[PDB]
Design a protein around this ligand. Structure first.
Ligand SMILES: CN1CCc2cccc3c2[C@@H]1Cc1ccc(O)c(O)c1-3
Ligand SMILES: CN1CCc2cccc3c2[C@@H]1Cc1ccc(O)c(O)c1-3
Ligand SMILES: [Ca+2]
Ligand SMILES: [Ca+2]
Ligand SMILES: [Ca+2]
Ligand SMILES: [Ca+2]
Ligand SMILES: [Ca+2]
Ligand SMILES: [Ca+2]
Lengths: 90, 90
């Protein structure tokens, strides 16, 4: 696989690693999302230690309002992080 | 870096590898986009060999209509490929 193909598969893998922990195995609840950010973006994003931050993140990502982050909403999250990563050095 | 962090950086890297070849170094023209797909998604996507397919792909991705694919539009492309990759086995 190319680096791009590996990256695509890595996005799928990390989503399911976390979404499969509790409840709907195909969506991230608040706790799953929090651990995803804290464990897997520890170099990019500040560790989340406040409920209010967890709440605000979910509220931002939860486009359809069902209180969870589904795959499509996670793709939008990845675009946000990647864009922020890309804009950091400008 | 985590796998997710590596993936984020890989998206940035592949975009610039191709966008930096000709013209605006921060956007993909048709030829840059074609080679990106043919070289870096050879296992996922059919190789593009027809002008009409290259045209249709750019038309689909070029949300703002400037005839090129910028970083934001590339993020949407990545979401499309990843979603298609994710839905393939269902
Ligand atoms: C390892 N790289 C080599 C090639 C390259 C070429 C332009 C830009 C970047 C990179 C990267 C990583 C990178 C990370 C964060 C950013 O904000 C960036 O703008 C870039
Ligand atoms: C290596 N993997 C291990 C874990 C895992 C768990 C669910 C789903 C997938 C994966 C992947 C790759 C994968 C690739 C394409 C898909 O359409 C998928 O649904 C998955
Ligand atoms: Ca879940
Ligand atoms: Ca389990
Ligand atoms: Ca949702
Ligand atoms: Ca270019
Ligand atoms: Ca050059
Ligand atoms: Ca454009």
């Amino acid at each position: 696989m190319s680096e791009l193909e590996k990256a695509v598969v890595a996005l799928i893998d990390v989503f399911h690693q976390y979404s499969g922990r509790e409840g709907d195995k195909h969506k991230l609840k608040k706790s799953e999302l929090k651990e995803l950010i804290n464990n897997e973006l520890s170099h990019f994003l500040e560790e989340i230690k406040e409920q209010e931050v967890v709440d605000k993140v979910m509220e931002t990502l939860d486009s359809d309002g069902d209180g969870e982050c589904d795959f499509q909403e996670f793709m939008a999250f990845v675009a946000m992080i990647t864009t922020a990563c890309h804009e950091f050095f400008e």
